[PDB]
Enzyme design. Structure first.
Site, PDB file in Angstrom:
ATOM      1  N   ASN A  36       4.315  40.283 -21.816  1.00 46.84           N
ATOM      2  CA  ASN A  36       3.888  41.276 -22.864  1.00 46.84           C
ATOM      3  C   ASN A  36       3.258  42.639 -22.237  1.00 46.84           C
ATOM      4  O   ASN A  36       2.556  42.642 -21.367  1.00 46.84           O
ATOM      5  CB  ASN A  36       2.664  40.814 -23.750  1.00 46.84           C
ATOM      6  CG  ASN A  36       2.246  41.606 -24.941  1.00 46.84           C
ATOM      7  OD1 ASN A  36       3.152  42.022 -25.572  1.00 46.84           O
ATOM      8  ND2 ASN A  36       0.723  42.026 -25.048  1.00 46.84           N
ATOM      9  N   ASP A 106       3.321  36.975 -16.458  1.00 47.98           N
ATOM     10  CA  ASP A 106       2.683  37.220 -17.758  1.00 47.98           C
ATOM     11  C   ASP A 106       2.916  35.953 -18.806  1.00 47.98           C
ATOM     12  O   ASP A 106       3.107  34.741 -18.378  1.00 47.98           O
ATOM     13  CB  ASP A 106       2.595  38.594 -18.141  1.00 47.98           C
ATOM     14  CG  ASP A 106       1.865  38.916 -19.327  1.00 47.98           C
ATOM     15  OD1 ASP A 106       0.589  38.976 -19.102  1.00 47.98           O
ATOM     16  OD2 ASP A 106       2.237  39.078 -20.418  1.00 47.98           O
ATOM     17  N   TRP A 107       3.345  36.472 -19.949  1.00 46.79           N
ATOM     18  CA  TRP A 107       3.918  35.286 -20.886  1.00 46.79           C
ATOM     19  C   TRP A 107       4.796  34.694 -20.563  1.00 46.79           C
ATOM     20  O   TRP A 107       5.271  33.680 -21.051  1.00 46.79           O
ATOM     21  CB  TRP A 107       3.601  35.938 -22.284  1.00 46.79           C
ATOM     22  CG  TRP A 107       2.352  35.974 -22.837  1.00 46.79           C
ATOM     23  CD1 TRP A 107       1.471  37.043 -22.999  1.00 46.79           C
ATOM     24  CD2 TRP A 107       1.538  34.890 -23.182  1.00 46.79           C
ATOM     25  NE1 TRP A 107       0.091  36.569 -23.459  1.00 46.79           N
ATOM     26  CE2 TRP A 107       0.384  35.236 -23.545  1.00 46.79           C
ATOM     27  CE3 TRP A 107       1.899  33.434 -23.017  1.00 46.79           C
ATOM     28  CZ2 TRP A 107      -0.736  34.367 -24.218  1.00 46.79           C
ATOM     29  CZ3 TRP A 107       0.474  32.720 -23.671  1.00 46.79           C
ATOM     30  CH2 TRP A 107      -0.689  32.834 -24.098  1.00 46.79           C
ATOM     31  N   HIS A 270      -1.273  44.780 -12.577  1.00 48.16           N
ATOM     32  CA  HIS A 270      -0.559  43.770 -13.464  1.00 48.16           C
ATOM     33  C   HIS A 270       0.922  43.738 -13.489  1.00 48.16           C
ATOM     34  O   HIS A 270       1.630  42.558 -13.181  1.00 48.16           O
ATOM     35  CB  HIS A 270      -0.800  43.595 -14.844  1.00 48.16           C
ATOM     36  CG  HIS A 270      -0.401  42.602 -15.635  1.00 48.16           C
ATOM     37  ND1 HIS A 270      -0.612  41.218 -15.388  1.00 48.16           N
ATOM     38  CD2 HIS A 270       0.502  42.652 -16.595  1.00 48.16           C
ATOM     39  CE1 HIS A 270      -0.042  40.632 -16.348  1.00 48.16           C
ATOM     40  NE2 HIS A 270       0.679  41.330 -17.110  1.00 48.16           N
TER      41      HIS A 270
HETATM   42 CL   LIG Z   1      -1.255  39.457 -23.740  1.00 45.54          CL
END
Ligand SMILES: [Cl-]
Ligand SMILES: [Ca+2]
Ligand SMILES: [Ca+2]
Ligand SMILES: [Ca+2]
Length: 294
Positions: A36, A106-107, A270
């Site tokens: 995301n 991440d996801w 990130h």
């Molecule tokens: Cl998120």
């Protein structure tokens, strides 16, 4: 390194919806999964490093990138379990075979780690970065955006995300160390140009993060893959980041216990693919070459 996408987008119908993906080359798959609020575009400068090493695949999650939105959309839509149903079905449809290398973020790491646990015989290797490697507590969440993520997980979230597009427009640039170009931001904004439910995936996602015990279903899924990864002998590449963001502190301490794992550190927060794509691409390619000797 560039704003141009890698490959051209292909489409396939899944559960009555069209999903978009990149699928370039021949051989065993190297499967790159975004989180995301990104898309396959995240990997555009990384995938080239793996040319000729396999079938290079990057799927757009449902409601993201060039994949269809799920109408009627609302607060119940785009939970982890729904994303998993679509992604499982797309991965089945792509005929991936039984020697897959996963490259996850991440996801995309929650989804990919869970899939790997369920399809472990088919997984040749796992490369991961800035991942959701286990359930966490608020103290483990990066301090910079802690209050904001708490706000996402409150009634304030709809205005922040659906109305104002904060995940795309604030969080994303805020967690990339170098300035993005006009074209790069345009590519990230494109699926989310319209206010309202078009942006729902970017709000449902933070609401799914397994933090402080909720949502309990995702907590349990992450506990399961955490336990499994900590014992699995499948080869792993951990791309650590400095300063990093999510995979720091206790989570990083845990990831560093995983078996059969090599680690490199690259610059980034990130969305590290935008800061150190050549370092990341080179490391993944080297990992794949070792997994796939002549
Ligand atoms: Cl998120
Ligand atoms: Ca084979
Ligand atoms: Ca707070
Ligand atoms: Ca506003």
């Amino acid at each position: 390194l560039g704003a141009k996408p890698f490959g051209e987008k292909k489409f396939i119908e899944i559960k009555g919806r069209r999903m978009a993906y990149i699928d370039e080359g021949t051989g065993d798959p190297i499967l790159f999964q975004h989180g995301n609020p990104t898309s396959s575009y995240l990997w555009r400068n990384i995938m080239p490093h793996c040319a000729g090493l396999g079938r290079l695949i990057a799927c757009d999650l449902i409601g993201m990138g060039d994949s269809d939105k799920l109408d009627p959309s609302g607060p119940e839509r785009y939970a982890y379990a729904e994303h998993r149903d679509y992604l499982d079905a797309l991965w089945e449809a792509l005929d991936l075979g039984d020697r897959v290398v996963l490259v996850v973020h991440d996801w995309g790491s929650a989804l990919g780690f869970d899939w790997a646990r369920r399809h472990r015989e088919r997984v040749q290797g796992i490369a991961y970065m800035e991942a959701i490697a286990m359930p966490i507590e608020w103290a483990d969440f990066p301090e910079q955006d802690r209050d904001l993520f708490q706000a996402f997980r409150s009634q304030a979230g709809e205005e922040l995300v659906l109305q104002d597009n904060v995940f795309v427009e604030q969080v994303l640039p805020g967690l990339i160390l170098r300035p993005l170009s006009e074209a790069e931001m345009a590519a990230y904004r494109e699926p989310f140009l319209a206010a309202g439910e078009a942006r729902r995936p970017t709000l449902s996602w933070p609401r799914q993060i397994p933090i402080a015990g909720t949502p309990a279903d995702v907590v349990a899924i992450a506990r399961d893959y955490a336990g499994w990864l900590s014992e699995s002998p499948i080869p792993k590449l951990f791309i650590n980041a400095e300063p990093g963001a999510l995979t720091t502190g206790r989570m990083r301490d845990f990831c560093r216990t995983w078996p059969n794992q090599t680690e490199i550190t690259v610059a980034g927060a990130h969305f590290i693919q935008e800061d150190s794509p050549d370092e990341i691409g080179a490391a993944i390619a080297a990992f794949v070459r070792r997994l796939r000797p002549a």
